[PDB]
Design a protein around this ligand. Structure first.
Ligand SMILES: [Cl-]
Ligand SMILES: [Cl-]
Ligand SMILES: [Cl-]
Ligand SMILES: [Cl-]
Ligand SMILES: [Cl-]
Ligand SMILES: [Cl-]
Ligand SMILES: [Cl-]
Lengths: 394, 395
């Protein structure tokens, strides 16, 4: 006779980044589930979608029917397949998985097939102001035990702009593209080939530029080259895959089956990068991991700062239960996040270790969460402009 | 600290058909899991594979690691992807899912995402000696509540005369057959109308272009599906079929290899997948296939003949209840002995199956009762199929 009684959205920013967490309560005393709905740049719109529409959709329903709730909820507004819509669904979906694990007395990874590895290998970012900082940051991370690192340019000369400039964060894609191989030549000379390197193109250059970059980086044996094209340009990956053998990852921006499915169907990528909440939670991410598995494509779920610890846990339960796990991107959490969210995964020398508590093994202290209210506002970095002032995909 | 302590193969034939059921015991008293390993025609070789090789692979391992056991077990002999190999894995895989469900206090369908429908629609066979017997069988099954039926010729155009001597076999005329099917369906639609859903199984009996022409001729009769229009060895003909016909197609009870179903589902060349769950290696792979099918809009139609244990029957149905893209469940009525040996058989009520809500697969086996029906072995006569000139044909 188990029923959903309450659905609320908790907005909190313990790490200085707006988060959304869905709590589903039931008619069984002390039984609730948590899920992540973090699309940080539209957090208030996500809250609106959950509070106004998902809440009346769910109250009175049997929470054990995860798939039925997903399939019906996904179409409940007719229109669908978007980042705000998918996050609203994810909050619910992950919470239901959390409830199912609690009822079963097992971690979500055990519901999904049990452990497929002994730890979850991580990669971290090495963001620096210039090349020497980046290199030292890599060395510091390798000392901490990281065996996979993202390497970017520091935060040839850029082109001169026109005589007036429309405000934005200016970037020179051609200067960038011509400079990346030099960076990796230097890093491989200094650090060797044992360490795994990731580089994120992050949709910043024209497609043929990305393809040429992929070819020029083959000799440096990257673990992957990430987002060489925008999702609007996935139709360029066929050409890239006729020419380059640099491993490719795509997908943190994906919100639609018609973005990832042609890529995985045609083996045009080697790693899938979706932000789990932004494709709708554990239910659809699990199916995607499986679809990827049968095509020899591996998982690399998005692991930035703009994911709640509930979402971090969701990534990692998928990770532990997938034979085709590739890598887990990881952004270190501060003490406030660990305090607000007891049960954060244990980070030890480049590997993550999940506790073996039931469901997602994570909780939220609502009183503590309330101490860190959301900021809102609009990010500056998404107003990217090329030297002539053209608004570009960031 | 849960461990597998014993793996055994129970061989029993309460329905007069050889079955293999794996029982996996643990170091927790009373906790065990059951799985189907029924490839009936090779049952003793399935037992040999499990007892000699799977049992020592598993003893002492943590049974909660289903996927790790599947992934390591599938490659434990290096060579893989076959009906005997896959059935040995399925016995184990299904038993482990049973164990996981028992441990969780929940049916396997609930582990897999919960109920996606309120009952499982079935189809049954209407096997008859001639056309009127088949038509009466359809009426009888419609009276019982079946809303979907398989319709075949009686077990017309005269068959071809054979050469002056004949090599023994079960003779069949594929051209007489193919020219007669549309007439059968014209008659059945004239008498019974279009509300009843019809399935027809080609069962790999004709050349591919014959099957393509037959699919086209049967369009007007609106079949729920036309089944196995080609052999697995001829799946490269389905592209041409799908350029021309819109009759829904099912394929796959013979499949044992990812390279059989994957190009078909990748290119949407079928509408239903028909694999025998144990024969592709269990719930673990069948679930993956159901999901791969879902994203391609392909629906499930797991094989449900007599040569499947009640444990396999339940495994099909736990998959069925938890798949959004469930299509249909073929169902073969069971006898008293099967029900007696295997307590927990699903409720069959007016064309729907209703699983009990017990943990695991909700099925058990009585080993003392099972021992009363020893397996027979031997060779089926029907698989020695020959065309009129005596050519050995795919049955
Ligand atoms: Cl949206
Ligand atoms: Cl960069
Ligand atoms: Cl992307
Ligand atoms: Cl074999
Ligand atoms: Cl029949
Ligand atoms: Cl029939
Ligand atoms: Cl027939």
């Amino acid at each position: 006779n188990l029923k959903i009684t309450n659905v609320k959205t908790i907005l909190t920013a313990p790490g200085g980044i707006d988060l959304a967490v869905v709590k589903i309560e039931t008619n069984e005393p002390g039984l609730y589930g948590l899920g992540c709905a973090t699309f940080t740049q539209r957090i208030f719109a996500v809250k609106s979608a959950i509070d106004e529409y998902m809440a009346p959709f769910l109250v009175g329903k049997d929470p054990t029917r995860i798939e039925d709730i997903w399939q019906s909820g996904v179409v409940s507004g007719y229109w669908r397949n978007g980042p705000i819509m998918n996050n609203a669904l994810s909050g619910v979906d992950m919470a239901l998985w959390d409830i199912k694990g609690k009822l079963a007395g097992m971690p979500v990874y055990d519901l999904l097939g049990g452990k497929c590895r002994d730890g979850i290998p991580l990669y971290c970012h090495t963001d620096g102001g210039d090349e020497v900082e980046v290199e030292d940051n890599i060395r510091a991370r390798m000392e901490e035990g990281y065996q996979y690192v993202r390497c970017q340019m520091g935060m040839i000369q850029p082109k001169r702009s026109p005589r007036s400039k429309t405000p934005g964060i200016y970037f020179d894609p051609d200067a960038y593209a011509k400079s990346v191989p030099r960076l990796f030549d230097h890093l491989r000379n200094k650090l060797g080939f044992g360490i795994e390197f990731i580089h994120d193109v992050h949709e910043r250059v024209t497609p043929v530029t990305a393809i040429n970059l992929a070819k020029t980086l083959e000799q440096y044996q990257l673990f992957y080259l990430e987002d060489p094209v925008a999702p609007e340009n996935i139709d360029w990956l066929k050409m890239l895959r006729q020419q380059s053998s640099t491993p490719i990852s795509m997908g943190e921006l994906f919100v639609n089956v018609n973005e990832w499915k042609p890529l995985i169907d045609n083996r045009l990528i080697d790693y899938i990068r979706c932000h789990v909440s932004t494709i709708g939670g554990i239910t659809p991410a699990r199916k995607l991991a499986v679809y990827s598995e049968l095509n020899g494509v591996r998982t690399a779920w998005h692991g930035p700062g703009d994911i709640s610890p509930v979402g971090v846990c969701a990534n990692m339960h998928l990770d532990l239960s997938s034979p085709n796990f590739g890598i887990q991107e990881y952004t270190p959490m501060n003490d406030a996040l660990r305090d607000v969210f007891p049960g954060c995964p244990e980070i030890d020398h480049g590997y993550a270790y999940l506790n073996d508590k039931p469901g997602l093994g994570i909780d939220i202290d609502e009183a503590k969460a309330a101490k860190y209210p959301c900021e809102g506002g609009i990010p500056s970095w998404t107003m990217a402009r090329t030297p002539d002032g053209t608004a570009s995909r960031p």
